[PDB]
From Swiss-Prot, chain B:
Active site positions: E51 (proton donor), E127 (nucleophile)
Binding site for Mg(2+) 2: N187
Taxonomic superkingdom: Bacteria
Record-listed Na(+) binding positions: F191, N194
Full-sequence portion shown in this chain: 412 to 615 of 1024
Effect of H130 to E/F/N: Poorly reactive with galactosyl substrates. Less stable to heat than wild-type
Name of the protein this chain belongs to: Beta-galactosidase
Family: Belongs to the glycosyl hydrolase 2 family.
Gene field: lacZ
């Protein structure tokens, strides 16, 4: 049959989909959601043998465990245990594109389990097996007899074993094929793995049972009153005495309850459903569900006899909330949302695609702790627990069908094909059927990157049709097709149009106003967080706030998909595309997260948190205005803290309780503020603190902040009585300067500061030189390949221009003596293939005070690409334990990504000054620094810097962070100016114009001295 | 042109049509039709099938068509003749002036139907004037309405020819047979003869 | 596999639907709507034998002609030939309602044909068979080997015989089932044939 190469066959003997069941035989266990003796896990120790093809399967396996088989834990991905390689491919199908066939050598997993079954289970009732997730297809045998088959790796497949099991010991046989006609719909940009990756369990249901149930909650105008409506269906023999009771609880308190016998309303000339019943319950003053306050109720559904005898009970958490689009806005409970979302794949560094509760909880808390209120399931139904969690912690969820055919040419090749309508429809209908009762799910998604075909319009309609409570969206075909209720583009820019043919990505502000358009616009993917990225994140947030119909978006994405690899010392290292011998592959492109695979945050995470704040602030006079962006709660777990400092030295500070209504404002008047004892800039910092712990946070959690410069007092005080005089020692080779226990040596041929001494100690491992390039960030690189270059990528424009090869030619080097100073003047050129790229003109002024004043004037030819940076750099001889500075921090920050950093005085261990991205690049910079401290050294001015043990060269020469080696000394990069980093997308130049170094003339000045 | 889909005998009518598990089968009946017949100028309207209630499968199929072939309106009578799966109010046997307010799926006077609150679609009876035996009593009354009301755009009489079959007596004398005559049981007796013309094309 | 008791299976190996084709190899003929050498009729005299259930059919019929078979005309309805009776039922299904199952005694029509195929058809291109109307479901074999399966008694079912035929004489075998899961979709008020 090779059912695996036929899209007309998606399953065989597979039972219908339905909401999560547990078949409790006690109502109370039901209400409290405790375990049920009728739902068993068969997770754990199973037998597994690997094969290259189904045809090689010893037909003996059927009846007898094979010996070569090993014992492995399940769920699991066999790639995770070493039988074979996981593959990282983005778009390119991992198999030759020739629908519906799959390759002849098709890695086949032979799973088998010997287990015992309670005859009590068999004497009555029905016993079904449940596979939460099998990647990509499988055949099932039980005691040597064939049971059935199933596809769609991301939804539960269930079979009735009632007639195949026997009293006692039994054997399950499972043949999982890596590839099937299903893979065609599974082209997601993630690792390609296989096996029984989700739970396996057994469910015992009575013969007469509840087979499906739907919960709806409708409201009046001010949401002061609701009707809970619950539709219940059954299987088994109908009887007059059969009953259904639906009751509703707010914890221990029974809020409402209703009972009816089976028998629906007349629906057609043929009558109605004998086997269904709809109960309706009034609820007054419902406590409403939102991501702000995740209020839930408990719904219990009992199937019982008229005498009162319970048959079984099913149940679910209920959230009273309405989702609707009105007058172009997406409303929740009558209020317009502002989606602070993130896309999140199910990925575990060691477990591959197997998920666990710990991990889930860990993700959610981080999410919440970072002011995220929503998540999109990119790009398939998640493990069932995710939803229970989102329900309870409170997150708005976008549930997406497991349909992605990005590798087809053109993209809607299968989706416009009626022969693919059935397989597609099941990926959508079975999702809806299983998840429809969860209140965290507020929007359905038809899938991802499948173009737009007629199959989508049909499926868009079935949904609206079956569940009118939630909008439907889909981004393929242009992001605004007839198959989406929301304009949901991916990577559309804030002000910048990107008019691609057929599917242009307009500027979001402009997209809203296109002639005739009236929908809301929430991006399904934005701010690609690859590597050192998130540049311009604030520009999105500003627009979202300014434009009502701009409703937020989902950043791409939560976590890096790097897997763990161990070296010969059995030391772990984070791996990506190709490190498994997998090819072709997409290298580092599977790493785009705000956190490392281990859940350690990347610096960008902080930027997201700040932009996504729920309180806005305004300053005026001694007046601070806090405005709440919450739509439903009052600031009942918040207090405001304020501090005033002078150049980091603390002056005053205090706290005031916050009490803001959702959408309201509060004015906090500040106390008369003492003036200060000297020059400098005062700065005001406010922060919002949550005094008490919550389900997702600890007491003292800071949820927001902001800063403002207050008054400033310029120093006018004139230095002091130069104590001594630097002496200049001119040789035909060097300009030498001496003052006390210090010496500076300037090479007359190079024109640079070759060496500096303190005591008899050399300070430099390499001369101080201007630097104009950076070890390329993911965003600078884009798609550019060494075999296929992207000449448009920043890296390429730079290389091609000779920026990384430019050479310093001295133009002039002079030394002069001043009343109390020694002054060296230099002029340098940086050429390439006969053109002058840049011209650097400096002055070095050494005074009796022993400070070296540096003045830099650079010229950059108009026709050369704008440089990564404009600064100086040197390898210090020294290595010290700490870095202290006064400026923006504490974390890494760049020009287009520095809103969340605060100006103050910071101090960290040298290592915190280096960001360990898997794909090494320029990293760890700090902007707006007025003073920098290291070893006995001090630099002052207005600049940006990074400091670590890695040269830019080594970084740009290295590909995995684990191959980096601490150089001798310390690398110091101090910039007058640094190029923004971009991030709108990581596949084309995305650095905004205002972050480009195109002024042509640049001027910076520094003072280096000693302590 | 009408899809080969009719599930009349289900209880309730839409049992299968509302069943996602039956969408695939249903869809091939709709998609394969359109794919074969879409270049015929004579085909002016597509129909989703007959007496199968109104299921979600209908609304999805309705959209597929509107989406692949906008050139033609799509109609369907099930579930009360004016649901969201029909561009045309296409009732079967709604009377001229008389309402027949059956529950869930009433059949309004056609004159009345057009102007129900909110309604604006044209109305063309998908079946009317059941021509069984000595029938067509009141035919003129429909015509009268058709001509006076712009939005009352006609209808398809039920139906063209009796579905009688030939059987032979002891002399080989052919006679017209109906339900039950072939020893078939259960059967609907003469209900299979409702045309304007005898099975041999001779006019009634 | 009992494909006829599963709405999940409505066809096997069937070619995609399309507007009427004739593959004219002369443009002017095409213009005139004249007959095409590439579009041949199989209508006419065939071999047929009735069975009470698919389980009663002899494997031998796949390989060779049933000597009990009669020679009948195709197309046709086997009830019109008296092999069994046609049923007039309006609303009530002619079979018990227990989807997607069908009765075990399920009248089966074994049709067969020995036909010619010119080598010119086989040297190049593709040779497909087209059944405009098979009620209600069927399996097809060509020269003893299984080709595919189909449902929907009212649209054409097309299969590629390219790899099954041989120049010269060839034998088709069609096993038609009276009832199938597709019967649930065919409850029209008319004779059941
Ligand atoms: O990491 C790049 C992401 C990733 O491929 C997403 O799955 C896909 O929707 C996409 N489209 N464009 N960029 N992306
Ligand atoms: O001959 C009566 C006719 C016939 O069964 C039609 O197929 C059906 O659509 C109908 N509905 N009401 N009356 N009919
Ligand atoms: Mg298949
Ligand atoms: Mg993709
Ligand atoms: Mg408070
Ligand atoms: Mg079938
Ligand atoms: Mg009927
Ligand atoms: Na907005
Ligand atoms: Na990616
Ligand atoms: Na690098
Ligand atoms: Na009219
Ligand atoms: Na009739």
């Amino acid at each position: 049959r090779r059912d695996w190469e036929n899209p007309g066959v998606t399953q065989l003997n597979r039972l219908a989909a339905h909401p999560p069941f547990a078949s409790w035989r006690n109502s109370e266990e039901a209400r409290t959601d405790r375990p049920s003796q009728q739902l068993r896990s068969l997770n754990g120790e199973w037998r597994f043998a690997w094969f290259p093809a189904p045809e090689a399967v010893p037909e003996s396996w059927l009846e007898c465990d094979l010996p070569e088989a090993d014992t492995v834990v399940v769920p699991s991905n066999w790639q995770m245990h070493g039988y074979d390689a996981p593959i990282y491919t983005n778009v390119t199908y991992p198999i030759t594109v020739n629908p519906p066939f799959v390759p002849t050598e098709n890695p086949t997993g032979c799973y088998s389990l010997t287990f015992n079954v309670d005859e009590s289970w068999l004497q009555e009732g029905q016993t079904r097996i449940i596979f939460d997730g099998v990647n990509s297809a499988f055949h099932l045998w039980c005691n040597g007899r064939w049971v059935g088959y199933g596809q769609d790796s991301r939804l539960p497949s269930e079979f009735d074993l009632s007639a195949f099991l026997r009293a006692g010991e039994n054997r399950l046989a499972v043949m999982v094929l890596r590839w099937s006609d299903g893979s065609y719909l599974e082209d997601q940009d993630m690792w390609r793995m296989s096996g029984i990756f989700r739970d396996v369990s057994l469910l015992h249901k009575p013969t007469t049972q509840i087979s499906d149930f739907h919960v709806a909650t409708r409201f009046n105008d001010d949401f002061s009153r609701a009707v809970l409506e619950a539709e219940v269906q059954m299987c088994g023999e109908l009887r007059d005495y059969l009953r259904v009771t639906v009751s509703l609880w707010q914890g221990e308190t029974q809020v409402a309850s209703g009972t009816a016998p089976f028998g629906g309303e007349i629906i057609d000339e043929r009558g109605g459903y004998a086997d269904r019943v709809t109960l309706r319950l009034n609820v007054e003053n419902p406590k409403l569900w939102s991501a702000e306050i995740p209020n839930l109720y408990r719904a219990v559904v009992e199937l019982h006899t008229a005498d009162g005898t319970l048959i079984e009970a099913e149940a679910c958490d209920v959230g009273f909330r309405e989702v609707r689009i009105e007058n172009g806005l997406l409303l929740l409970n009558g209020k317009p949302l502002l989606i602070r979302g993130v896309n999140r794949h199910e990925h575990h560094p060691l477990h591959g695609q197997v998920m666990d509760e710990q991990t889930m909880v860990q993700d959610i808390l981080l999410m919440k702790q970072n002011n995220f209120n929503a998540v999109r399931c990119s790009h398939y139904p998640n493990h069932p627990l995710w939803y229970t969690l989102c329900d309870r912690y409170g997150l708005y969820v976008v549930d997406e069908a497991n349909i992605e055919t990005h590798g087809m040419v053109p993209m809607n090749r299968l989706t416009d094909d009626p022969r693919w309508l059935p397989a597609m429809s099941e990926r959508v209908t079975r999702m809806v059927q299983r998840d429809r009762n969860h209140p965290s799910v507020i929007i359905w998604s038809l899938g991802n990157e499948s173009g737009h075909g007629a199959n989508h319009d049909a499926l868009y309609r079935w949904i609206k049709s079956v569940d009118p409570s939630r909008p439907v969206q889909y981004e393929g075909g242009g992001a605004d097709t007839t198959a989406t209720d929301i304009i949901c583009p991916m990577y559309a820019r804030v002000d910048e149009d990107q008019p691609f043919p057929a599917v242009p990505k307009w500027s979001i502000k402009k997209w809203l106003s296109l002639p005739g358009e009236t929908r809301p616009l929430i991006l399904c993917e934005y701010a690609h967080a690859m590597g050192n990225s998130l540049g311009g994140f604030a520009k999105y947030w500003q627009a979202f706030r300014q434009y009502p119909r701009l409703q937020g978006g989902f950043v791409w994405d939560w976590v890096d998909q790097s897997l763990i690899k161990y070296d010969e010392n059995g030391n772990p290292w984070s791996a990506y595309g190709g490190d498994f011998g997998d090819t072709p592959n997409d290298r580092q492109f599977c790493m785009n997260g705000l956190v490392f695979a281990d859940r350690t945050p990347h610096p960008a995470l902080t930027e997201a948190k700040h932009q996504q704040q729920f309180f806005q602030f305004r300053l005026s006079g001694q007046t601070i205005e806090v405005t709440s962006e919450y739509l439903f709660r009052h600031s009942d777990n918040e207090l405001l803290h304020w501090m005033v400092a002078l150049d980091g030295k603390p002056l005053a500070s205090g706290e005031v309780p916050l009490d803001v209504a959702p959408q309201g404002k509060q004015l906090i008047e500040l106390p008369e503020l003492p003036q200060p004892e000297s020059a400098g800039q005062l700065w005001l910092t406010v922060r919002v603190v949550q005094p008490n712990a919550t389900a997702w946070s600890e007491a003292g959690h800071i949820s927001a902040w902001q800063q403002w410069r207050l008054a400033e007092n310029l120093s006018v005080t004139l230095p002091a009585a130069s104590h001594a005089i630097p002496h200049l020692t001119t040789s035909e080779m060097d300009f030498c300067i001496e003052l006390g226990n210090k010496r500076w040596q300037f090479n007359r041929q190079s024109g640079f500061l070759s060496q500096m001494w303190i005591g008899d100690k050399k300070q430099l491992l390499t001369p101080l030189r201007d630097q104009f390039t950076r070890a390329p960030l993911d965003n600078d690189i884009g798609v550019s390949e060494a075999t296929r270059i992207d000449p448009n990528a920043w890296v390429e424009r730079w290389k091609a221009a000779g920026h990384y090869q430019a050479e310093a030619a001295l133009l002039q080097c002079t030394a002069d003596t001043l009343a109390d100073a020694v002054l060296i003047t230099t002029a340098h050129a940086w050429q390439h293939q006969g053109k002058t790229l840049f011209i650097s003109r400096k002055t070095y002024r050494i005074d009796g005070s022993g400070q070296m004043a540096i003045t830099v004037d650079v010229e950059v030819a108009s026709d050369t690409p704008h440089p990564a940076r404009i600064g100086l750099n040197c390898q210090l001889a020294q290595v010290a334990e700490r870095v202290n500075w006064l400026g923006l921090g504490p974390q890494e920050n760049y020009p287009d990504r520095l809103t969340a950093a605060c100006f103050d005085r910071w101090d960290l261990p040298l290592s915190d000054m280096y960001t360990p991205y898997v794909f090494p690049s320029e990293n760890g910079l700090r902007c707006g620094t007025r003073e920098l401290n290291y070893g006995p050294h001090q630099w002052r001015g207005d600049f940006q810097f990074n400091i670590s043990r890695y040269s830019q060269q080594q970084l740009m020469e290295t590909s995995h962070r684990h191959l980096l080696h601490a150089e001798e000394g310390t690398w110091l990069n101090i910039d007058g100016f640094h190029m923004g980093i971009g991030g709108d997308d990581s596949w084309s130049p995305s650095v905004s114009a205002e972050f480009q170094l195109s002024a042509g003339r640049y001027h910076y000045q520094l003072v280096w001295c000693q302590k």
